[model samples]
Target: KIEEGKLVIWINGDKGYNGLAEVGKKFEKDTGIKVTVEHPDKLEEKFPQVAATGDGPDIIFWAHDRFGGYAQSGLLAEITPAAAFQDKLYPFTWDAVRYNGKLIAYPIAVEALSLIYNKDLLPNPPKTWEEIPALDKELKAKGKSALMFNLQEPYFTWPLIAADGGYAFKYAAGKYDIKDVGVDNAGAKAGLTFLVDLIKNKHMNADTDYSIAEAAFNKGETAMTINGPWAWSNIDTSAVNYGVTVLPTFKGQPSKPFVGVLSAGINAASPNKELAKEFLENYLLTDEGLEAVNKDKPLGAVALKSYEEELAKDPRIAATMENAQKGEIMPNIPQMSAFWYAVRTAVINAASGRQTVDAALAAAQTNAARAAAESFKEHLQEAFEDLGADNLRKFKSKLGDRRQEPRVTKSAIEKLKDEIDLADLMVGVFTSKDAVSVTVEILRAIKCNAVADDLLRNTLE
Candidate 1:
């Protein structure tokens, strides 16, 4: 049945997705489809549950990274538009929206970090990483720093990792093998050490964060800084003549930023499938529609080929296009989510002199492994719980005779219950058929064998 009339879209509550509000208004005017754009809190976490229940909005607008997981979970509709439809996107953008070779989303714009500098202070962009130190000294003389960035954030710092040939996962063959995390490799250390080198000197500080770095840039306190297109709104271009260009080279290699796609995808469970496709293909495909969505600044290099020419008409968009050509697309894999905080912690710790580079790297791997294990355990627990008590008890007999002694007592469980969730007690106990073996190992490791006997006894039986 051909569906028409009102269509719902769940846009990210953040300003990044606010561009769709105006686009939605224009879409209603043109197509007579009353488009309601809802900015629900925690859309990413909420959408999956809602969509799984077959009550999700027709469209979801936001970054492309999370779509891989959604597509894997059977939440996104596979959109097959015109054969030429994909040609409308930038080079790296096609792969971004494709999950396992299925087109999972509509690419809106291509985004990546670049050097946005004050033309007044810096007549020319610094070409090499080594050139930055002298430039830093020069800026210091004038009561300003040469460069600044949210060094504590991994998204912004991953470019440095790429510059040194490091990546979160070695992406290839249309799938990101989670087993191939390269964050603590030699290349990663090279990039991390460079930041630490800057920190060891007075060139940059470990305390600099997004707000502080952005404020410093806006106030003209920094001559050069690393940022993305989303940052344009914060800077009044009329007030500062900022030059946007590729990141300065580091150690004879170009600092390649991770290119991200701001995209839209249809909910597979949406009731208004035809209208959603029309809204995206007919309306968003138009130059006028795309322009309205990107009215503020060229959000990034646009996905449409015709609109690409239109976007380049804006100087800011042109620069973004230039850098995006050299940027690496941020991998959109489930495991990629686990990489960020681990790297961020290591970056912050090592740069702030809290830990040595080797120590920081060790901690990063440890944290990532623990996080991956915890996430796996939580999901596994939920899977088991989804099975009824009778079904869950099928594995209970396997928990027999595992206790070398009894380590986890009821009182200890009571004491730790306030500080810990008993649900998280044995990460591997329910996962393996050799439940007793896994239980013994867990009890021995945490030395809670005596303290958690009832936990095992109650949970398993």
Candidate 2:
């Protein structure tokens, strides 16, 4: 049940694996459990498939954004840290690791966007958005742009867009009200309007992308750009003298960038759950353990307050951490997928002048709502199909007998005469508590253990 004497962890990059490998050696010596750190290509894509079959790694080190969907799909286990441990970490880091008010992972590092500028181009970076135009005019004489970044990317633009109270999803009472999208709100419209005006006035390019912006900045053609600490590798290698600072305010409102947390989460199906948790809390979260893991490649803004002195040694890390203090944690809900698509499309349409800002944002909100609804239906249908055609057929017949108690009418069962029809009905009608309980009971009776187990595991109630 404990997976014998070994534990496996899936990490994304070589640096991360190397760092964890160092920590693993110490863990093995102390606990006698051999820790294998794997650098899997496309870890995100592969984790879900293996996890469904109960053959995935015991632990996965990844960004917090992905864990919301993982937790909802029953791929990750809920983990509650000891109060002493939680208190030592930054409070905002908790927001990323929690979904539906439950802790699903342990925060390791935090990151957020900041103003990165070429020291040679601008002696001092602007402190407000109003100062950008004059800086742009001055830079034009020197054959450079005042500022450039990935124009259509929401991650990079969220600070500017949210400077005036715009947000992707309203987070209140420890949960994101996905239905209450704020992209088309007045504050969001005002923020996007300013960017569109920049595009129209030749101060910025509608077609500027990540690569172009990074290349221009590296070549000294851009005075300033918005980016996170991850860009340091390329920028350092390019010999650009750069400085990092908090994003400029917009009309007296602070620019609120989206903060991101990288974490290590336990797989719900892992047999070595106890061992994995012990390794994370006792080994990975310790000062020696964290230092070993960060030795090869430093983490972006270490979340533990204990690392504050070390972090101060690097100006970029300190600046980004300072910026993160004033930022909002990115929404870690599955509905974020819809938010990304809608915002990107709106940015493109409005920036290109094909549609007005108001019109584009209005369309985006509608499209996002539709997409979220469609995604929910698709997930329900997929879950229903997992019962298999044979089990579904048996379930259809069984449901007919319990119509009175379960309250599914005769006509309803008669209408769903086949597996496809039954699936359609399940997706449509499995909304109430009674319907869910009844379906779970029937699936268990029909020996659809796997699907029934999943239904129980994933049901929030």
Candidate 3:
């Protein structure tokens, strides 16, 4: 059943509401379907729960990273974009909206990190990391630092880490292999060591966060800062004369930052899904609609290819797009939740000298792997309860006998009194594939047929 008269969209904040207002008004005039743009607090956190109950807005506008989780939970409707429209947008933007071979969102704009430098302090930004030390010395004499940014933020630091071939997870064939955590690899070790050395040598601040970095840059206390196109508004409001440029090379390798796409997706449960899709495809995606939104609230680097000439005219947008061309699309996998915390902690520990780069990254790798496996803890517990004590023992023995792995040792199996305990053991033993197949087989072997079927269904879907 289609809701004919109205469509509701939950946007991030006041800026988003303002950005869409003009286009929304036009959409109403063209189709007689009024668009209500809402700015809700904790939208991302509250969305999944509301959406599950079929009681949220018809459309959601958010970063592309969250779409993977939404699609996995069956919250977003798969969208088929017209080839003509798809060709008119930047190809890379499509990557962020794809999940398991499905297109689930409409890309609006793209953003990535760039070096925003105060031209007065440094007439020319360093072309490479090797040039930074000398520039730092020169800036130190002038009571400034060569560069500053959110030191512990993976989003800001990933370019440097990945320049030498470090990554949180291995991406291949349009998906991320969460099991292949590479944060502790040799390339990451070298990258992290470089950052730690900068902090130790006083070239960058160990405690600097986004606000601190931006504040100092605005006040001309720092020569440069690594940030995205979103920083332009704040910097433009200040008196600083700045120029945006690609990040300096590290070890002759181009830095690969994460490209984040801002996008809109339809709620699968919306009664007005058809109307929502009509508004998005026929009205909102038009060049006029996009231009109207940008006019009201300037989009950083629009995904629309039609904006190429205009984007190039703006130095900031051009520099960001250039960097984005050399960047990796931010992985939209649900496991990315674990990756963020693990990488941030590792970077912080190393930067603060609390641990060596090797130690920090090694811990991060372990922590990420554990968290990924723990996502299945609840289901495992349910299966265990259904097996009962004697059957559970038999199930464990069977699993042990079949795998012959250290993760299912007699002592380990005996210690499994709860879901968490089982999860911890599985973290060592099960890859995502093994976690399901092995557990399902053992549950069925022990005559817990219903429990095994339930687990299999939940995982496969």
Candidate 4:
């Protein structure tokens, strides 16, 4: 088959074999550029090796935040030119794929979790995390089940953790600097406590997966589960009617689900760059591509232009899309690997009621600090330059109230640089997986000599 224009792409793994197929058909039909998408060479062997060597695919569809290791290693492409689309998509879509001043990917889908409940069994969903237990009690009293929960999956714990002000990593230098890892912050600990409390109170059973949860809901054993749109596919609409809404609030933030963006990136080595660009210019960048974006992914579309159509078709999708705009994108930091293992441990420990919330948080904080320390050597001077800004981190003012000169710890300039204002960094000074661009803007503000006169800005703030 001697095609005039053809491109080959490799999926990251088995879970993704069909994703390329889905897009390839649409891409080929839309752009007239033939695309052959297939599963890659040995998933286990190739992914890491290609990543290590920086010889990966020309077009990759992935959630950018989760690939910090690749980005830091220079294995990923920056498709910022994708954003000549800012005027087209939802505000968050452009922000979703933007990492380190580069367009890492073209956002294809946006995901958000909602507390889905069986409407026939329980008429009202809990308004807050604290209220879940009582509702569970009522359900049990009526011979109904409560919730399906698992500690291992990020989907289950993320919204709970976010409401408690817990985050996985901090962003810095247009990359992730592990600030608070796992669930270490007070808000995070509070979030953990909420979950453990629910378990202790018998509001949820920790042994449920998506299938069991959905089956239970349909069979009338379970009342609710936290899930995104994909879960809807499994639900028999005639059997059970469920409702979807934004994740309830925790701390000051809502039950913020982890928002992962599925985007298309032009391979740096992609010989068909012209076609890739044209696809966007003609399809993805226009009303036609916008329609397909929401239709194909359906969790939400990046293009706001097509959002009204989605809102018209399924209001829930539109709402979820709006909430998607509010979430944290796991962050696009290279040091993410440094924190995941620890985060898993801390979250699992806390979720099980085996450890005190503080203890678990302390563990996560230690892991995060270690991750940051490891990445510290790479961005020492830059962070210091960041800290040097006056009126910056208002929380770390404990360094000293003295306005005479910048606060200095007992350590040397190098040591001081390593002593990061992690709290500040986690919130925005460094990394925000959800809003990597906002994180960058914060850095620029600091980098722009964003100064406060009286004393060095507090790092805790």
User: What RMSD does each model have against the real structure?
Assistant: 8.7, 12.1, 9.1, 14.4
Q: Per-residue lDDT tens digits of candidate 1, residues 269-314?
A: 5567777777788777778877766665446777777767755687
In candidate 3, stretches whose alpha carbon ends up further than 4 angstroms from where it belongs are 1-5, 13-16, 28-34, 38-42, 81-92, 171-176, 371-461
Model 1 RMSD in angstroms: 8.7
lDDT for each candidate structure: 0.66, 0.71, 0.72, 0.55
lDDT of 2 by residue, 248-345 (tens): 88889888887777888887877777887788778778778877766666678677788766767887777776787788766677766656655665
Q: Which ten residues in a row have the lowest lDDT in candidate 4?
A: 452-461
Residue 61 lDDT in candidate 2: 79
For residues 299-417, what per-residue lDDT tens digits would candidate 3 score against the true structure?
Answer: 77777777656667877677877888898777787877667755655665456543456655665677686544444645776777766777766776776576444334454456445
Q: For model 2, name the residue pairs that clash.
A: none
TM-score of each: 0.74, 0.70, 0.73, 0.65
Q: Sort by lDDT, best first: what order?
A: 3, 2, 1, 4
**TM-score leader:** 1
